[PDB]
Design a protein around this ligand. Structure first.
Ligand SMILES: OC[C@H]1O[C@H](O[C@H]2[C@H](O)[C@@H](O)[C@@H](O[C@H]3[C@H](O)[C@@H](O)[C@@H](O[C@H]4[C@H](O)[C@@H](O)[C@@H](O)O[C@@H]4CO)O[C@@H]3CO)O[C@@H]2CO)[C@H](O)[C@@H](O)[C@@H]1O
Ligand SMILES: [Ca+2]
Ligand SMILES: [Ca+2]
Length: 418
């Protein structure tokens, strides 16, 4: 497991990770207080499946609750009140056990951290930050969803729970928790939540301070139309917006450019996510995914959130694409372990590894066929990927001797290796 920084110092840990999103939105409801036992038990399995890292849920206990009609949620970790690890996922003891098992099996553990806000109103919690000291966004004048003097990023909904992450004392508190996660909970890196909520640069500071050489990924879900009109980003592509963030945080970023094309364009347009970028400095920072706990469904209640779900008719094509292309791929727990795509995903992980495809591998798209047709230059082998295409044989688009590596869904999914 190669573990360097990119040529631009971005913390992509070698550029060869394959990540599992270690949870779905309803886990706290479906397997209450049992999740860490489940992962401990599945540890060997996850490692054998080919994952090099697991994105764990928020470790900080969350006992929040909300309801707006038919819809209810809370306790998933995004509205935590303390750094106490005895939450809805299991005990501190179980977490440690789980992190130990995972790590033992060779799987790095990446924790989801939420620095933007906290469950301010939670009556019983270990962290109490008073009003009037500049600890809160609302300690300042808060016009709208724009940076105020107490918060250099957007706010979460109303902004009444937003922290001044830049206050020396707030910064220092997070800093110390990141170091703790690394030293006692085996953190190999972090997934930075709601990154639009605070400065990019703070993330670099935090990584530098606590886990300089670890892996990090930022979740920036904010489209061009969410920036002010005078902002260059109001008129930029989704790619530019996320790339800009990554340049400043010095961390890989979720490929929302790819996700938006998967949702709104045709398969041929998939070549427009960050990961298809002709500049390696651009595509190597992309962290690709098909669905996450927000965008996709989850077993159980209300089908989870499904804010921007990829239809089942494209799931195999979507996985085939991310698993065989540049950037760092992420697999959603549910597709892997609940819905039966596991076998299919397993095969693709093996193709990816056999080919030596990494974050900066070159990708070329071919214009004369239907669907998406790409040539990927893995370090070990060349891959020909034809999704929902009329392509006849790999030789129509690439030089070399190819063997069929994958052929699924009545040929809608075909991958050949050199
Ligand atoms: O005190 C502040 C605010 O509190 C109240 O907000 C509620 C929301 O109405 C609920 O919808 C909910 O919010 C969830 C959100 O629904 C859910 O998607 C999740 O969001 C994450 C997301 O998973 C993640 O990927 C990331 O990028 O960012 C999001 C934020 O971290 O988690 C949210 C928190 O549970 O719960 C909150 C708080 O209970 C109130 O209604 C507001 O007026 C108020 O300002
Ligand atoms: Ca690595
Ligand atoms: Ca904020």
């Amino acid at each position: 497991d190669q573990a360097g920084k990119s040529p631009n110092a971005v913390r992509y840990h070698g550029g060869d990770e394959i990540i599992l999103q270690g949870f779905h939105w309803n886990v706290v409801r479906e397997a209450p207080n049992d999740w860490y036992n489940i992962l401990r038990q599945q540890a060997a399995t996850i490692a054998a499946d080919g994952f090099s890292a697991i994105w764990m849920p928020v470790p900080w206990r969350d006992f929040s609750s909300w309801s707006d009609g038919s819809k209810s949620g809370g306790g998933e970790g995004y509205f935590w009140h303390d750094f106490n690890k005895n939450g809805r996922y299991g005990s501190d003891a179980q977490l440690r056990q789980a992190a130990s098992a995972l790590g033992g099996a060779g799987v790095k553990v990446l924790y989801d951290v939420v620095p933007n806000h906290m469950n301010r109103g939670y009556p019983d919690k270990e962290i109490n930050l008073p009003a009037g000291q500049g600890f809160w966004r609302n300690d300042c004048a808060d016009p709208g969803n724009y940076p105020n003097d107490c918060d250099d990023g957007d706010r979460f909904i109303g902004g009444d729970a937003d922290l001044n992450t830049g206050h020396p004392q707030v910064y220092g508190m997070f800093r110390d928790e990141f170091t703790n996660l690394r030293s006692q909970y085996g953190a190999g890196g972090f997934r930075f939540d709601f990154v639009r909520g605070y400065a990019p640069e703070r993330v670099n500071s935090w990584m530098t301070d606590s886990a300089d050489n670890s892996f990090c990924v930022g979740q920036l879900w904010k489209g061009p139309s969410e920036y002010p009109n005078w902002d260059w980003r109001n008129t930029a592509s989704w790619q530019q917006i996320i790339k800009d963030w990554s340049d400043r945080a010095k961390c890989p970023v979720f490929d929302f450019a790819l996700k938006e094309r998967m949702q709104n364009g045709s398969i041929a347009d998939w070549k427009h996510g960050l990961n298809g970028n002709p500049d390696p400095r651009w595509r190597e920072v992309a962290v690709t995914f098909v669905d996450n706990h927000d965008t996709g469904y989850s077993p159980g209640q209300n089908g989870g959130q499904h804010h921007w779900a990829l239809q089942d008719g494209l799931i195999r094509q979507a996985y085939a694409y991310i698993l065989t292309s540049p950037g760092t791929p992420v697999v959603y727990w549910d597709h892997m372990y609940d819905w039966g795509y596991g076998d299919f995903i397993r095969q693709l992980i093996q193709v990816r590894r056999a080919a030596g495809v990494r974050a900066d591998s070159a990708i070329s798209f071919h214009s004369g066929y239907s669907g998406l047709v790409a040539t990927v230059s893995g370090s070990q082998q060349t891959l020909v990927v034809a999704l929902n295409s009329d392509l006849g044989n790999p030789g129509q688009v690439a030089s070399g001797s190819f063997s069929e590596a994958v052929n699924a869904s009545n040929g809608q999914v075909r991958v050949w290796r050199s």
